[PDB]
C-alpha cells in the first residue's frame, strides 16, 4: 500500500507500506527515507496525533492518505 | 444531520484542507478533534493546535460548537479555549462548512480582531506593541503547542 | 483619593482618584495605566455593577476601596 | 530587577565581550539589544548577528528570554530565533549574566547539539555531511548576516 507524509517544508514523502504496520514502523521508514530518527517524529491524521502502538488500520488509514509530519520536541 | 455529517467528513477526503485536519475522535460523528498547523506567516509557527468541534442536534442549521483544547496567546481566543470569531455565531450559514470554519480560524490566527477581543490586555498588546505580542504568541507555541 | 482596582491576573491597580468622580472617569484613569479602553472594563463594588454615570460617592466607595474589573464582553 | 539589570550593564563596560555587545535598545532597560560576531572558528564567520533580550520582571530569579532577529541556519535555533540553549530553561541560575548567556550563544554557534535540535533537518544535515551543514550555514551568513 502507498501512502504520502507531508512536511512542513511543503516535501511529500512517498511511503510503502501495509494496513497492519503500526505508527512506530512508519516512523522507522520515514527514518529510512529522510533520517530523522522517530524522537523527532510527529504524525498528525484525521485530526488525531498518531499512537505508536497502533496500526494504520486502526486510524483507518488507507491507500494515498497524506500523513503530516510535525516537529516533536522534548524541549532543548 | 447524520447525512450532512458524513457528506462533509467526505469532502475533506476529496479535497483535504492543507495544515488542517479533522474526524470523529471515536465513534460519534457529532464529535470532531481536529488539528491546525501553526500558519507559516504567523507567531504560531511550528506549533501544532488542537481543537474540538461538537456538532448540534439541529446542524446545519444551528452552527458547530468549537474550541481550543491546546493553549494558546491571542486577541481573539480565551484561556478556556473559547473562540471568537463572526462564523461560528452570528455570520453562521448552513452554507458553510467545517473546513471552511477551520480556514477561517486559520486566517484568524495570522490576522487577530483586537477591536472586538476575547482578551483584552493581549489585544492592547498586538495594538500598542506588535513585536512584544509577536515574541510572546512564539514563546507559548513552544511552551503548549509542540 | 487613593483607591485599588484588582484585576483577574491578580495584579492591583493604585488610581489617584475623588469622591465625585463618575465611574466614567475612574474606567479612564484606568485606561491611562493599564491602556484598556472603557468598552471592555466592568466594574464590581459592593455586590453592584457600577453605572458609567454615578460617581464613587453614590457607591460610597471610600479611600483604600478595592474595585473589581472584570470582562466587558460585546460578544465577538 | 532594576539594579541587577543596571549592575550587569555596566559589569559589560569594565569587561566587555570580545565579538559581542549589548544595551538597552531604548529607555526600557528590561529591553536589550545584542549583537554577535560569528565567531572565528565556525562557518558563521564574518556574519553579524543580531539578539534581543527581554528581562522578566522576577529576574534573575527568572532567566531573560533571548532570541536571534538575525536569520541563521543552525540546528539549535529555528526559522523564528528561538534558542535551544539548557542555560535559557532547565540550568539558568541567578548567579548567571547577560554576559555568561552570550558566551554560553557563542560557544553554541561553534558546537551545535544536534542529538538535542530545534530543528531536526539541519541537526541531521551536520551529524551525517558535516561539509553540507558548513557549505549552507556559510551561504545563509553571506545571505542574512553581512
Same mark, same amino acid.
Not at chain 2, 70 to 79: G, L
Not at chain 2, 103 to 121: A, K, M, Q, R, T
Given at each position: 500500500?502507498?501512502?504520502?507524509?507531508?512536511? $512542513?517544508?511543503?516535501?511529500?514523502?512517498? $511511503?510503502?507500506?501495509?494496513?497492519?504496520?503500526?505508527?512506530?514502523?512508519?516512523?522507522?521508514?520515514?527514518?529510512?527515507?529522510?533520517?530523522?530518527?522517530?524522537?523527532?517524529? @510527529?504524525?498528525?491524521?484525521?485530526?488525531?496525533?498518531?499512537?505508536?502502538?497502533?496500526? $494504520?488500520?486502526?486510524?483507518?488509514?488507507?491507500?494515498?492518505?497524506?500523513?503530516?509530519?510535525? $516537529? @516533536?520536541? @522534548?524541549?532543548? | 444531520?447524520?447525512?450532512?455529517? %458524513?457528506?462533509?467528513? =467526505?469532502?475533506?477526503?476529496?479535497?483535504?484542507?492543507?495544515?488542517?485536519?479533522? +474526524?470523529?475522535?471515536?465513534?460519534?460523528?457529532?464529535?470532531?478533534?481536529? #488539528?491546525?498547523?501553526?500558519? %507559516?506567516? =504567523?507567531?504560531?509557527? +511550528? +506549533?501544532? !493546535?488542537?481543537? #474540538?468541534?461538537? !456538532?448540534?442536534?439541529?446542524?446545519? !442549521?444551528?452552527?458547530?460548537?468549537?474550541?481550543? #483544547?491546546?493553549?494558546?496567546?491571542?486577541? &481573539?481566543? %480565551?484561556?478556556? +479555549?473559547?473562540?471568537?470569531?463572526?462564523?461560528?455565531?452570528?455570520?453562521? =450559514?448552513?452554507?458553510?462548512?467545517?473546513?471552511?470554519?477551520?480556514?477561517?480560524?486559520?486566517?484568524?490566527?495570522?490576522?487577530? %480582531?483586537?477591536?472586538?477581543?476575547?482578551?483584552?490586555?493581549?489585544?492592547?498588546?498586538?495594538? #500598542?506593541?506588535?513585536?512584544?505580542? &509577536?515574541?510572546? =504568541?512564539?514563546?507559548?507555541?513552544?511552551?503548549?503547542?509542540?
Amino acid at each position: 500500500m502507498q501512502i504520502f507524509v507531508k512536511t $512542513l517544508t511543503g516535501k511529500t514523502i512517498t $511511503l510503502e507500506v501495509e494496513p497492519s504496520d503500526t505508527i512506530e514502523n512508519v516512523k522507522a521508514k520515514i527514518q529510512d527515507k529522510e533520517g530523522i530518527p522517530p524522537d523527532q517524529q @510527529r504524525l498528525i491524521f484525521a485530526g488525531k496525533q498518531l499512537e505508536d502502538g497502533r496500526t $494504520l488500520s486502526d486510524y483507518n488509514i488507507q491507500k494515498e492518505s497524506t500523513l503530516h509530519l510535525v $516537529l @516533536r520536541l @522534548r524541549g532543548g | 444531520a447524520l447525512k450532512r455529517i %458524513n457528506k462533509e467528513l =467526505s469532502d475533506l477526503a476529496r479535497d483535504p484542507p492543507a495544515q488542517c485536519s479533522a +474526524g470523529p475522535v471515536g465513534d460519534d460523528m457529532f464529535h470532531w478533534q481536529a #488539528t491546525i498547523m501553526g500558519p %507559516n506567516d =504567523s507567531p504560531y509557527q +511550528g +506549533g501544532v !493546535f488542537f481543537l #474540538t468541534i461538537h !456538532f448540534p442536534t439541529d446542524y446545519p !442549521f444551528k452552527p458547530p460548537k468549537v474550541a481550543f #483544547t491546546t493553549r494558546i496567546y491571542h486577541p &481573539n481566543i %480565551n484561556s478556556n +479555549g473559547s473562540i471568537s470569531l463572526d462564523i461560528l455565531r452570528s455570520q453562521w =450559514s448552513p452554507a458553510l462548512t467545517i473546513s471552511k470554519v477551520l480556514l477561517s480560524i486559520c486566517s484568524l490566527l495570522c490576522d487577530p %480582531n483586537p477591536d472586538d477581543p476575547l482578551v483584552p490586555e493581549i489585544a492592547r498588546i498586538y495594538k #500598542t506593541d506588535r513585536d512584544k505580542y &509577536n515574541r510572546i =504568541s512564539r514563546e507559548w507555541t513552544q511552551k503548549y503547542a509542540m
